[PDB]
Amino acid sequence: GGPSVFLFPPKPKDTLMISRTPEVTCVVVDVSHEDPEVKFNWYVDGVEVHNAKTKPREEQYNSTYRVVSVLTVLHQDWLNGKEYKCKVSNKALPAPIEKTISKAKGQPREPQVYTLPPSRDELTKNQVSLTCLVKGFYPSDIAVEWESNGQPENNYKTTPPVLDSDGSFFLYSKLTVDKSRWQQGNVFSCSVMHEALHNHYTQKSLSLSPGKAERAALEELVKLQGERVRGLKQQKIEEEVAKLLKLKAQ
Amino acid sequence: GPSVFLFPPKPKDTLMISRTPEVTCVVVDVSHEDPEVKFNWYVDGVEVHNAKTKPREEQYNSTYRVVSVLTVLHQDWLNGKEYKCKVSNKALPAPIEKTISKAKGQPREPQVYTLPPSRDELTKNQVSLTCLVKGFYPSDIAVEWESNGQPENNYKTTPPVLDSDGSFFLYSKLTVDKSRWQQGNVFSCSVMHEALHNHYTQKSLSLSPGKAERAALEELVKLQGERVRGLKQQKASAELIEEEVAKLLKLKAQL
């Protein structure tokens, strides 16, 4: 047993938002101080590529080196299921080691997002738990955050994806808030990114009483469409502005 | 060379006195060149001799996997005693020593909360009953669902997640046909943890009618009772009586 090669996929969030840079990471561990040089060759569907960045080596606790190579990938390439291969050469190896990685294969399935208010039993406590169930998704690569009035909530934790009996995945995200914020009728939003959602995005809202969050969302859309009409009017025209006035009325 | 893993007892086995908690020491990648392996077990530095070694299982890569299982006392494990597995093998420069114990820290009682299905989910054929278990320490816990004193078989539980206050939470999701939920069946989320009285608690969850819905139900019961008594006092088909009596019984059941 000489050096070992491990290959890690991009962060789920990075593959789904076009604004972010998804990268595959090739980690070589148990590199001897004797022969600590490592050459990486990268291949995309068998075709060699040259855009990989090499990180500086790091000392492991067992007085060996860990060496990392990071390859930027195209959103579409990763999601289309292109195979990424890392070939590692080192003098302490009889031959180069190859590892391969790609997105999980299988019929992608759209996540169903369900918000759950606090248990009546939990309303005795000073903090309450807002629950978001995300279920029936494939593959397991997913991102969940919480918002309140278009601003990120930071006091939440998400479970890892769990394999369901039907071969899809589910998880739960738990947002903790002061009971006062809940009782005041604030609207909280569970926001989910996944490859199988329209625009890779959905959100579900949740508040102390039923139609209040639905009414709130409708008013927000009215505001934005009003700004859109005002915008197009200040910009210039008449046909397109009329169509946007029909949207506002809807 | 060979690698040693040490695994703790199943949480349910440490909590029920009827069950046998065991620590498992697994050695993998043992060469059939030097395939003899001696296990020494220590409880808080003190060697013990009650360990049962399983046979030897030639792996696909023509190496051996050897497993040693040490039965532990419920009390010893929960009191946080350290269990050490020392593995000696001629292909090793020195013996490999691995240690395991229950997490150290103030044990904290889990709070159990059942959550009915999202209104949005009641459009679908199956619904999710949710059990939130939070504020527990340490992470060792067991969660099952029951209905009418029988394990429900379509549920999964998440791994314990570390909360921002240093305690753990998880969720257990029971999937049921929406019919079973709608018809007012009681489901129970059952939790075992060292910090619970009797290492056990249960929380139930069902559909029942509100205050206003109960009133309407009582009115229908009255009228259908009059209708049934009417048809019985009169002579109408046992058919029609059967149908009407069945409806009346179903109404009463909903209360």
mmCIF file of N, CA and C in Angstrom, chain B residues 68-168:
data_model
loop_
_atom_site.group_PDB
_atom_site.id
_atom_site.type_symbol
_atom_site.label_atom_id
_atom_site.label_comp_id
_atom_site.label_asym_id
_atom_site.label_seq_id
_atom_site.Cartn_x
_atom_site.Cartn_y
_atom_site.Cartn_z
ATOM 1 N N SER B 68 -13.732 -9.809 16.634
ATOM 2 C CA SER B 68 -13.848 -10.168 18.073
ATOM 3 C C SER B 68 -14.971 -9.324 18.694
ATOM 4 N N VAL B 69 -15.892 -9.978 19.394
ATOM 5 C CA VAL B 69 -17.103 -9.343 19.986
ATOM 6 C C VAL B 69 -16.987 -9.455 21.503
ATOM 7 N N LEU B 70 -16.987 -8.319 22.190
ATOM 8 C CA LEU B 70 -16.956 -8.249 23.666
ATOM 9 C C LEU B 70 -18.339 -7.833 24.167
ATOM 10 N N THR B 71 -19.005 -8.714 24.912
ATOM 11 C CA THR B 71 -20.249 -8.389 25.642
ATOM 12 C C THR B 71 -19.859 -7.429 26.762
ATOM 13 N N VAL B 72 -20.655 -6.376 26.971
ATOM 14 C CA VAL B 72 -20.401 -5.342 28.017
ATOM 15 C C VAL B 72 -21.606 -5.327 28.949
ATOM 16 N N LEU B 73 -21.405 -4.814 30.166
ATOM 17 C CA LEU B 73 -22.500 -4.544 31.128
ATOM 18 C C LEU B 73 -23.122 -3.189 30.770
ATOM 19 N N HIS B 74 -24.451 -3.166 30.585
ATOM 20 C CA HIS B 74 -25.260 -1.951 30.329
ATOM 21 C C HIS B 74 -24.692 -0.788 31.154
ATOM 22 N N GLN B 75 -24.502 -1.002 32.448
ATOM 23 C CA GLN B 75 -24.112 0.021 33.450
ATOM 24 C C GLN B 75 -22.712 0.541 33.085
ATOM 25 N N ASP B 76 -21.784 -0.367 32.755
ATOM 26 C CA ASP B 76 -20.367 -0.040 32.438
ATOM 27 C C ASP B 76 -20.317 0.922 31.243
ATOM 28 N N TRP B 77 -21.039 0.584 30.173
ATOM 29 C CA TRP B 77 -21.074 1.386 28.927
ATOM 30 C C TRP B 77 -21.645 2.774 29.223
ATOM 31 N N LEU B 78 -22.797 2.826 29.900
ATOM 32 C CA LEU B 78 -23.555 4.081 30.181
ATOM 33 C C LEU B 78 -22.794 4.934 31.204
ATOM 34 N N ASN B 79 -21.977 4.333 32.077
ATOM 35 C CA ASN B 79 -21.154 5.064 33.078
ATOM 36 C C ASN B 79 -19.915 5.660 32.403
ATOM 37 N N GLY B 80 -19.658 5.315 31.136
ATOM 38 C CA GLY B 80 -18.648 5.974 30.284
ATOM 39 C C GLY B 80 -17.298 5.285 30.344
ATOM 40 N N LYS B 81 -17.263 4.020 30.780
ATOM 41 C CA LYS B 81 -16.028 3.193 30.838
ATOM 42 C C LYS B 81 -15.426 3.097 29.436
ATOM 43 N N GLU B 82 -14.100 3.215 29.343
ATOM 44 C CA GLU B 82 -13.314 3.119 28.083
ATOM 45 C C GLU B 82 -13.015 1.654 27.779
ATOM 46 N N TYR B 83 -13.317 1.215 26.565
ATOM 47 C CA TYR B 83 -13.067 -0.146 26.051
ATOM 48 C C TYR B 83 -11.940 -0.044 25.022
ATOM 49 N N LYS B 84 -10.844 -0.762 25.260
ATOM 50 C CA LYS B 84 -9.653 -0.792 24.379
ATOM 51 C C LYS B 84 -9.529 -2.188 23.765
ATOM 52 N N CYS B 85 -9.331 -2.229 22.453
ATOM 53 C CA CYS B 85 -9.024 -3.435 21.654
ATOM 54 C C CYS B 85 -7.568 -3.310 21.195
ATOM 55 N N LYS B 86 -6.703 -4.227 21.633
ATOM 56 C CA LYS B 86 -5.292 -4.335 21.175
ATOM 57 C C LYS B 86 -5.205 -5.536 20.229
ATOM 58 N N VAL B 87 -4.707 -5.314 19.012
ATOM 59 C CA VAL B 87 -4.546 -6.376 17.979
ATOM 60 C C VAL B 87 -3.051 -6.608 17.743
ATOM 61 N N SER B 88 -2.591 -7.845 17.949
ATOM 62 C CA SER B 88 -1.200 -8.285 17.678
ATOM 63 C C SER B 88 -1.206 -9.254 16.495
ATOM 64 N N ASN B 89 -0.257 -9.073 15.579
ATOM 65 C CA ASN B 89 -0.128 -9.862 14.328
ATOM 66 C C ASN B 89 1.329 -9.743 13.892
ATOM 67 N N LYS B 90 1.910 -10.832 13.383
ATOM 68 C CA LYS B 90 3.372 -10.903 13.117
ATOM 69 C C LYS B 90 3.733 -9.929 11.991
ATOM 70 N N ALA B 91 2.799 -9.648 11.074
ATOM 71 C CA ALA B 91 2.982 -8.698 9.950
ATOM 72 C C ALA B 91 2.896 -7.243 10.438
ATOM 73 N N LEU B 92 2.814 -6.991 11.751
ATOM 74 C CA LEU B 92 2.722 -5.614 12.304
ATOM 75 C C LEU B 92 4.018 -5.273 13.026
ATOM 76 N N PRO B 93 4.585 -4.067 12.792
ATOM 77 C CA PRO B 93 5.739 -3.599 13.561
ATOM 78 C C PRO B 93 5.459 -3.563 15.072
ATOM 79 N N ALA B 94 4.238 -3.193 15.457
ATOM 80 C CA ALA B 94 3.783 -3.099 16.863
ATOM 81 C C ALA B 94 2.310 -3.477 16.934
ATOM 82 N N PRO B 95 1.757 -3.760 18.130
ATOM 83 C CA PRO B 95 0.317 -3.990 18.254
ATOM 84 C C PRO B 95 -0.455 -2.702 17.926
ATOM 85 N N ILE B 96 -1.634 -2.820 17.308
ATOM 86 C CA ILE B 96 -2.578 -1.685 17.066
ATOM 87 C C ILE B 96 -3.599 -1.641 18.208
ATOM 88 N N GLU B 97 -3.749 -0.471 18.827
ATOM 89 C CA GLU B 97 -4.663 -0.232 19.971
ATOM 90 C C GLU B 97 -5.685 0.804 19.523
ATOM 91 N N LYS B 98 -6.967 0.498 19.662
ATOM 92 C CA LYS B 98 -8.097 1.413 19.371
ATOM 93 C C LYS B 98 -8.953 1.464 20.630
ATOM 94 N N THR B 99 -9.530 2.617 20.938
ATOM 95 C CA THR B 99 -10.324 2.843 22.172
ATOM 96 C C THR B 99 -11.695 3.375 21.773
ATOM 97 N N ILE B 100 -12.720 3.054 22.551
ATOM 98 C CA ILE B 100 -14.096 3.566 22.333
ATOM 99 C C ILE B 100 -14.775 3.690 23.691
ATOM 100 N N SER B 101 -15.584 4.723 23.858
ATOM 101 C CA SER B 101 -16.432 4.903 25.057
ATOM 102 C C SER B 101 -17.636 5.748 24.674
ATOM 103 N N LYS B 102 -18.685 5.712 25.487
ATOM 104 C CA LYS B 102 -19.850 6.598 25.291
ATOM 105 C C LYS B 102 -19.318 8.041 25.363
ATOM 106 N N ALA B 103 -19.918 8.968 24.619
ATOM 107 C CA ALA B 103 -19.530 10.400 24.618
ATOM 108 C C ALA B 103 -19.589 10.921 26.056
ATOM 109 N N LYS B 104 -18.641 11.758 26.438
ATOM 110 C CA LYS B 104 -18.615 12.420 27.767
ATOM 111 C C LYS B 104 -19.448 13.704 27.688
ATOM 112 N N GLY B 105 -20.126 14.112 28.757
ATOM 113 C CA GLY B 105 -20.955 15.332 28.762
ATOM 114 C C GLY B 105 -22.228 15.109 29.543
ATOM 115 N N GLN B 106 -22.831 16.186 30.056
ATOM 116 C CA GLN B 106 -24.098 16.129 30.829
ATOM 117 C C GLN B 106 -25.157 15.497 29.930
ATOM 118 N N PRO B 107 -25.675 14.287 30.242
ATOM 119 C CA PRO B 107 -26.810 13.729 29.512
ATOM 120 C C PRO B 107 -28.048 14.622 29.656
ATOM 121 N N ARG B 108 -28.767 14.833 28.551
ATOM 122 C CA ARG B 108 -29.933 15.746 28.438
ATOM 123 C C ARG B 108 -31.115 14.953 27.872
ATOM 124 N N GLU B 109 -32.293 15.151 28.456
ATOM 125 C CA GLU B 109 -33.542 14.408 28.152
ATOM 126 C C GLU B 109 -34.042 14.864 26.780
ATOM 127 N N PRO B 110 -34.349 13.940 25.844
ATOM 128 C CA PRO B 110 -34.953 14.317 24.572
ATOM 129 C C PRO B 110 -36.368 14.865 24.762
ATOM 130 N N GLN B 111 -36.723 15.907 24.013
ATOM 131 C CA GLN B 111 -38.110 16.414 23.898
ATOM 132 C C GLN B 111 -38.694 15.860 22.595
ATOM 133 N N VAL B 112 -39.830 15.180 22.680
ATOM 134 C CA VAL B 112 -40.473 14.486 21.533
ATOM 135 C C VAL B 112 -41.731 15.257 21.118
ATOM 136 N N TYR B 113 -41.819 15.613 19.841
ATOM 137 C CA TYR B 113 -42.914 16.416 19.246
ATOM 138 C C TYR B 113 -43.401 15.712 17.978
ATOM 139 N N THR B 114 -44.678 15.347 17.906
ATOM 140 C CA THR B 114 -45.289 14.780 16.680
ATOM 141 C C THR B 114 -45.897 15.925 15.867
ATOM 142 N N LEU B 115 -45.748 15.870 14.552
ATOM 143 C CA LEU B 115 -46.220 16.914 13.619
ATOM 144 C C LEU B 115 -47.099 16.252 12.572
ATOM 145 N N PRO B 116 -48.364 16.685 12.423
ATOM 146 C CA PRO B 116 -49.224 16.162 11.367
ATOM 147 C C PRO B 116 -48.727 16.535 9.981
ATOM 148 N N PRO B 117 -49.304 15.957 8.909
ATOM 149 C CA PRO B 117 -48.920 16.294 7.542
ATOM 150 C C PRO B 117 -49.192 17.763 7.204
ATOM 151 N N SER B 118 -48.321 18.379 6.410
ATOM 152 C CA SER B 118 -48.570 19.657 5.700
ATOM 153 C C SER B 118 -49.914 19.573 4.972
ATOM 154 N N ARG B 119 -50.700 20.651 4.971
ATOM 155 C CA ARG B 119 -51.970 20.705 4.205
ATOM 156 C C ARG B 119 -51.671 20.383 2.731
ATOM 157 N N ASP B 120 -50.572 20.903 2.177
ATOM 158 C CA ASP B 120 -50.147 20.676 0.767
ATOM 159 C C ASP B 120 -49.994 19.184 0.461
ATOM 160 N N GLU B 121 -49.627 18.363 1.444
ATOM 161 C CA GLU B 121 -49.336 16.919 1.229
ATOM 162 C C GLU B 121 -50.646 16.113 1.184
ATOM 163 N N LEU B 122 -51.762 16.652 1.695
ATOM 164 C CA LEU B 122 -53.063 15.927 1.771
ATOM 165 C C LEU B 122 -53.684 15.787 0.370
ATOM 166 N N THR B 123 -53.147 16.449 -0.657
ATOM 167 C CA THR B 123 -53.579 16.234 -2.064
ATOM 168 C C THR B 123 -53.044 14.881 -2.553
ATOM 169 N N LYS B 124 -51.889 14.432 -2.056
ATOM 170 C CA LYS B 124 -51.199 13.192 -2.524
ATOM 171 C C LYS B 124 -51.832 11.947 -1.881
ATOM 172 N N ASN B 125 -51.453 10.748 -2.346
ATOM 173 C CA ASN B 125 -52.048 9.432 -1.974
ATOM 174 C C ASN B 125 -51.502 8.936 -0.630
ATOM 175 N N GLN B 126 -50.220 9.196 -0.372
ATOM 176 C CA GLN B 126 -49.529 8.886 0.913
ATOM 177 C C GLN B 126 -49.216 10.195 1.647
ATOM 178 N N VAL B 127 -49.262 10.186 2.977
ATOM 179 C CA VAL B 127 -48.876 11.367 3.802
ATOM 180 C C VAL B 127 -47.755 10.985 4.768
ATOM 181 N N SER B 128 -47.041 12.002 5.241
ATOM 182 C CA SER B 128 -45.880 11.903 6.148
ATOM 183 C C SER B 128 -46.318 12.354 7.539
ATOM 184 N N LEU B 129 -46.206 11.459 8.506
ATOM 185 C CA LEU B 129 -46.279 11.807 9.938
ATOM 186 C C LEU B 129 -44.851 12.016 10.408
ATOM 187 N N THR B 130 -44.594 13.153 11.052
ATOM 188 C CA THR B 130 -43.234 13.600 11.428
ATOM 189 C C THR B 130 -43.110 13.567 12.945
ATOM 190 N N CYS B 131 -42.006 13.018 13.422
ATOM 191 C CA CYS B 131 -41.604 13.028 14.841
ATOM 192 C C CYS B 131 -40.273 13.766 14.975
ATOM 193 N N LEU B 132 -40.277 14.905 15.658
ATOM 194 C CA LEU B 132 -39.072 15.686 15.986
ATOM 195 C C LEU B 132 -38.638 15.268 17.389
ATOM 196 N N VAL B 133 -37.406 14.797 17.529
ATOM 197 C CA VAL B 133 -36.753 14.481 18.827
ATOM 198 C C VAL B 133 -35.551 15.405 18.930
ATOM 199 N N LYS B 134 -35.525 16.305 19.916
ATOM 200 C CA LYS B 134 -34.478 17.352 20.015
ATOM 201 C C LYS B 134 -34.023 17.577 21.461
ATOM 202 N N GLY B 135 -32.866 18.218 21.596
ATOM 203 C CA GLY B 135 -32.267 18.618 22.877
ATOM 204 C C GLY B 135 -31.731 17.439 23.657
ATOM 205 N N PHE B 136 -31.368 16.336 22.997
ATOM 206 C CA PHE B 136 -30.854 15.132 23.697
ATOM 207 C C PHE B 136 -29.329 15.091 23.646
ATOM 208 N N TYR B 137 -28.772 14.460 24.680
ATOM 209 C CA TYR B 137 -27.331 14.140 24.800
ATOM 210 C C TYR B 137 -27.169 12.890 25.654
ATOM 211 N N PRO B 138 -26.243 11.963 25.310
ATOM 212 C CA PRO B 138 -25.493 11.998 24.048
ATOM 213 C C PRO B 138 -26.361 11.531 22.866
ATOM 214 N N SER B 139 -25.752 11.334 21.691
ATOM 215 C CA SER B 139 -26.434 11.103 20.390
ATOM 216 C C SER B 139 -27.041 9.699 20.304
ATOM 217 N N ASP B 140 -26.689 8.788 21.209
ATOM 218 C CA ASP B 140 -27.160 7.374 21.186
ATOM 219 C C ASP B 140 -28.662 7.352 21.521
ATOM 220 N N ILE B 141 -29.508 6.890 20.596
ATOM 221 C CA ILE B 141 -30.995 6.981 20.698
ATOM 222 C C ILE B 141 -31.638 5.954 19.763
ATOM 223 N N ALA B 142 -32.874 5.543 20.033
ATOM 224 C CA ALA B 142 -33.637 4.587 19.199
ATOM 225 C C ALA B 142 -35.068 5.097 19.049
ATOM 226 N N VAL B 143 -35.581 5.135 17.823
ATOM 227 C CA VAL B 143 -36.916 5.702 17.498
ATOM 228 C C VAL B 143 -37.652 4.727 16.587
ATOM 229 N N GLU B 144 -38.886 4.380 16.934
ATOM 230 C CA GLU B 144 -39.776 3.526 16.107
ATOM 231 C C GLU B 144 -41.172 4.136 16.130
ATOM 232 N N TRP B 145 -41.999 3.737 15.182
ATOM 233 C CA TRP B 145 -43.433 4.083 15.131
ATOM 234 C C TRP B 145 -44.286 2.837 15.343
ATOM 235 N N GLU B 146 -45.402 3.035 16.054
ATOM 236 C CA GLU B 146 -46.433 2.015 16.312
ATOM 237 C C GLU B 146 -47.791 2.547 15.845
ATOM 238 N N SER B 147 -48.679 1.612 15.542
ATOM 239 C CA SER B 147 -50.135 1.833 15.416
ATOM 240 C C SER B 147 -50.816 0.587 15.978
ATOM 241 N N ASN B 148 -51.720 0.771 16.942
ATOM 242 C CA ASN B 148 -52.470 -0.356 17.550
ATOM 243 C C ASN B 148 -51.449 -1.407 18.004
ATOM 244 N N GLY B 149 -50.431 -0.960 18.764
ATOM 245 C CA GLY B 149 -49.409 -1.786 19.445
ATOM 246 C C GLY B 149 -48.616 -2.679 18.498
ATOM 247 N N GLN B 150 -48.414 -2.250 17.253
ATOM 248 C CA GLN B 150 -47.666 -3.009 16.221
ATOM 249 C C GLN B 150 -46.723 -2.047 15.524
ATOM 250 N N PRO B 151 -45.439 -2.429 15.313
ATOM 251 C CA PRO B 151 -44.520 -1.632 14.516
ATOM 252 C C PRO B 151 -45.077 -1.366 13.110
ATOM 253 N N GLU B 152 -45.043 -0.079 12.724
ATOM 254 C CA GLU B 152 -45.307 0.407 11.357
ATOM 255 C C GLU B 152 -44.028 0.189 10.568
ATOM 256 N N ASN B 153 -44.097 -0.259 9.318
ATOM 257 C CA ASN B 153 -42.862 -0.757 8.655
ATOM 258 C C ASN B 153 -42.359 0.232 7.603
ATOM 259 N N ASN B 154 -43.231 1.088 7.090
ATOM 260 C CA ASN B 154 -42.800 2.169 6.173
ATOM 261 C C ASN B 154 -42.437 3.436 6.965
ATOM 262 N N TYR B 155 -41.401 3.402 7.824
ATOM 263 C CA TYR B 155 -40.763 4.645 8.345
ATOM 264 C C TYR B 155 -39.234 4.613 8.200
ATOM 265 N N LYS B 156 -38.613 5.795 8.114
ATOM 266 C CA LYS B 156 -37.140 5.982 8.190
ATOM 267 C C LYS B 156 -36.845 7.077 9.221
ATOM 268 N N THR B 157 -35.678 7.033 9.845
ATOM 269 C CA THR B 157 -35.182 8.023 10.823
ATOM 270 C C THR B 157 -33.863 8.617 10.317
ATOM 271 N N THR B 158 -33.662 9.921 10.475
ATOM 272 C CA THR B 158 -32.415 10.611 10.071
ATOM 273 C C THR B 158 -31.362 10.291 11.113
ATOM 274 N N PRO B 159 -30.071 10.375 10.752
ATOM 275 C CA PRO B 159 -29.007 10.333 11.740
ATOM 276 C C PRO B 159 -29.125 11.518 12.682
ATOM 277 N N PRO B 160 -28.618 11.400 13.929
ATOM 278 C CA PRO B 160 -28.633 12.517 14.864
ATOM 279 C C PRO B 160 -27.814 13.653 14.260
ATOM 280 N N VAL B 161 -28.291 14.887 14.361
ATOM 281 C CA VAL B 161 -27.550 16.078 13.863
ATOM 282 C C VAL B 161 -27.199 16.949 15.072
ATOM 283 N N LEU B 162 -25.995 17.491 15.095
ATOM 284 C CA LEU B 162 -25.523 18.389 16.171
ATOM 285 C C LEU B 162 -26.216 19.737 16.011
ATOM 286 N N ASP B 163 -26.929 20.165 17.048
ATOM 287 C CA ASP B 163 -27.647 21.460 17.086
ATOM 288 C C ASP B 163 -26.672 22.539 17.565
ATOM 289 N N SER B 164 -27.009 23.811 17.351
ATOM 290 C CA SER B 164 -26.140 24.967 17.684
ATOM 291 C C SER B 164 -25.982 25.106 19.205
ATOM 292 N N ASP B 165 -26.847 24.503 20.022
ATOM 293 C CA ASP B 165 -26.695 24.563 21.505
ATOM 294 C C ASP B 165 -25.857 23.388 22.045
ATOM 295 N N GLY B 166 -25.247 22.570 21.187
ATOM 296 C CA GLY B 166 -24.420 21.414 21.596
ATOM 297 C C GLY B 166 -25.217 20.158 21.920
ATOM 298 N N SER B 167 -26.549 20.174 21.829
ATOM 299 C CA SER B 167 -27.393 18.948 21.928
ATOM 300 C C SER B 167 -27.621 18.385 20.521
ATOM 301 N N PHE B 168 -28.305 17.252 20.418
ATOM 302 C CA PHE B 168 -28.626 16.594 19.130
ATOM 303 C C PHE B 168 -30.134 16.633 18.870
#
